[PDB]
């Protein structure tokens, strides 16, 4: 339920300056 | 056990695709603002004279310029357009690998 599928998949490939902040750059690593 | 299939993608191509994806995302805001299936283009309006104004979108050579009045220019600050509705000839420049003639070569027929 936390985050969304599209947000998680958008936090998987880009992990650099263009991370778009939001919940994608949030604490997705380490749960 | 069985011999390794030796996937054809390898890691050099994966690195190239990752770099291209980062550049495209930062350029077009496809993932964040485009909802994953649309491209967001920003216009540029400075001054307009009434006898109409021409606006150029930030992604070059993708959408042709148009003439609009002051109110239309104000209301047209941002534009979102599906990738299916993009012009077919001009959508190929968004990525060199969107479509490329692999055997460019010569001769043939």
């Amino acid at each position: 339920p936390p985050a969304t599928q599209i947000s998680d998949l958008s936090k998987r490939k880009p992990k650099t300056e263009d991370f778009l902040t939001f919940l994608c750059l949030r604490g997705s690593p380490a749960l | 056990s069985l011999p390794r299939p030796h996937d054809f993608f390898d890691a050099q191509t994966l690195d190239a695709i990752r770099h291209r994806a980062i550049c495209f995302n930062l350029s077009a805001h496809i993932e964040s603002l485009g909802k994953g299936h649309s491209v967001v283009f920003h216009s540029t309006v400075i001054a307009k004279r009434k006898e109409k104004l021409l606006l150029h979108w930030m992604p070059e050579d993708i959408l042709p310029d148009v003439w609009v009045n002051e109110s239309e220019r104000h209301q047209l600050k941002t534009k979102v357009v599906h990738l299916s509705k993009l012009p077919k000839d001009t959508a190929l420049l968004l990525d060199p690998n969107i479509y490329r003639t692999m055997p460019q070569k010569r001769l043939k027929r």
Partner: protein
């Protein structure tokens, strides 16, 4: 530059992945799919009219005419045999695309058209300036390990290469060829002395400023035919007109070089032409100034157009985009849902994405309803039929 090579490598990887996805989705799109990798690539493919139906077996035997494109070895004129599953069944019946004959040929064959009145006589376009008329009945099945034998007829009236070749369906003989010397010649043949070596061209047609890329006879009238060149013009020639330089019609018909041409089997007026402008156009001979619908769904040049032999409003095109599309003329211009509009125009009926290199040639089987055989440049031949669900 290294950028070009890197992009080529990435594109090759993407092509492989797309092919894997298509093969994974194959059974949900077709009713039959058979793929055979030839020893050498073939630049031509045409079904023979004859069909053999054995009694008590659930399959039939059809024939094919193929060429060969070898880098340094001997070139042949291979005639293959294909076994189609009829309506019932097969899983394992041993050979299914086995060859039948090989005849030695001097150079690769660009066209392998057969004579409609007598399918035994086969005419081919050689890379040289001579067009050879073969007769595969007389020649032995096993090729002789020597040079090119007697072709039994050597028609020579050209001065360079060629790619266009047509046979008169209404009259016996009367072959037409379009070559790269800006000329098209007419050969009477048939009424020629036996043990002949060289046959002179009956008539010489010169009205195109550029290389003529195709030529075709009219399927209903025995005295009229049309030719297309790469200078963006479609001419409609008339035989026995006492004028070999000025054609009856000179419609420009396209923006870029025009490649192919095909007449409608049923209608006496409708024809279609293809070009490098990524566009296929339909016309009616009664009104040549007005152009009918124009299909725009390809991404590269279109090299072939073929009207369906059994349907009024079905037509297919192929090209360098590694794709083949099927068009329906009765479906053009009607309302569609947004999802369908995103998928494609309503006229587009099918997109076949099973090939990895450029499509070289294809044809429909006269003896079977909706089956097409296509050959690509990576030495791969495919015989396929779309699902009956698509066309009800």
């Amino acid at each position: 530059d290294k950028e070009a090579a890197f992009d080529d490598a990435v594109e090759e990887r993407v092509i492989n992945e797309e092919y894997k996805i298509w093969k994974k989705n194959t059974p949900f799109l077709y009713d039959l799919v058979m793929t055979h990798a030839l020893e050498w690539p073939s630049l031509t493919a045409q079904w023979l009219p004859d069909v053999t139906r054995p009694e008590g077996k659930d399959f039939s035997i059809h024939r094919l005419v193929l060429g060969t494109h070898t880098s340094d070895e001997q070139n042949h004129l291979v005639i293959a045999s294909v076994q189609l599953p009829n309506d019932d069944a097969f899983g394992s019946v041993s050979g299914k695309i086995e060859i039948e004959i090989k005849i030695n040929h001097e150079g690769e064959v660009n066209r392998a058209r057969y004579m409609p009145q007598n399918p035994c006589i086969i005419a081919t376009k050689t890379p040289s300036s001579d067009v050879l008329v073969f007769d595969y009945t007389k020649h032995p099945s096993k090729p002789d390990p020597s040079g090119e034998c007697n072709p039994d007829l050597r028609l020579r009236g050209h001065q360079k290469e060629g790619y266009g070749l047509s046979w008169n369906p209404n009259l016996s003989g009367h072959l037409l060829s379009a070559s790269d010397d800006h000329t098209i010649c007419l050969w009477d043949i048939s009424a020629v002395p036996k043990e002949g070596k060289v046959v002179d061209a009956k008539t010489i047609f010169t009205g195109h400023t550029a290389v003529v890329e195709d030529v075709s006879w009219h399927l209903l009238h025995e005295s009229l035919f049309g030719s297309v060149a790469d200078d963006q013009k479609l001419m409609i020639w008339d035989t026995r007109s006492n004028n070999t330089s000025k054609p009856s019609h000179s419609v420009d018909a396209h923006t870029a070089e025009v490649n192919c041409l095909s007449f409608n089997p049923y209608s006496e007026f409708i024809l279609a032409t293809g070009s490098a402008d990524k566009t296929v156009a339909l016309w009616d001979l009664r009104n040549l100034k007005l152009k009918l619908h124009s299909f725009e769904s390809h991404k590269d040049e279109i090299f072939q157009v073929q009207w369906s032999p059994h349907n009024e409003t079905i037509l297919a095109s192929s090209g360098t985009d590694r794709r083949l599309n099927v068009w329906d003329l009765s479906k053009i211009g009607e309302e569609q849902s947004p999802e369908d509009a995103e998928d494609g125009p309503p006229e587009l009926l099918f997109i076949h994405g099973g090939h990895t290199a450029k499509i070289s040639d294809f044809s429909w089987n006269p003896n079977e309803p909706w089956v097409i055989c296509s050959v690509s440049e990576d030495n791969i031949m495919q015989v396929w039929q779309m699902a009956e669900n698509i066309y009800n």
